[PDB]
Amino acid sequence: RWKIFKKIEKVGRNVRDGIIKAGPAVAVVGQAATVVK
């Protein structure tokens, strides 16, 4: 109702903004690898 919403909403823009702003390799590799395997 609020927790999940605010959470997913925040985290959603957080990651994106973080990856777009700078664009680290750890997060990308990790996330991708985790999502793939």
Automatic annotation (TrEMBL):
It comes from the Eukaryota. The keyword Secreted applies. The keyword Secreted applies. It is found in: Secreted. Its main location: secreted. GO terms for cellular component: extracellular region. Keywords: Antimicrobial, Immunity, Innate immunity, Secreted, Signal. GO terms for biological process: antibacterial humoral response; defense response to Gram-positive bacterium; innate immune response. Belongs to the cecropin family. This is Cecropin. It comes from Papilio xuthus.
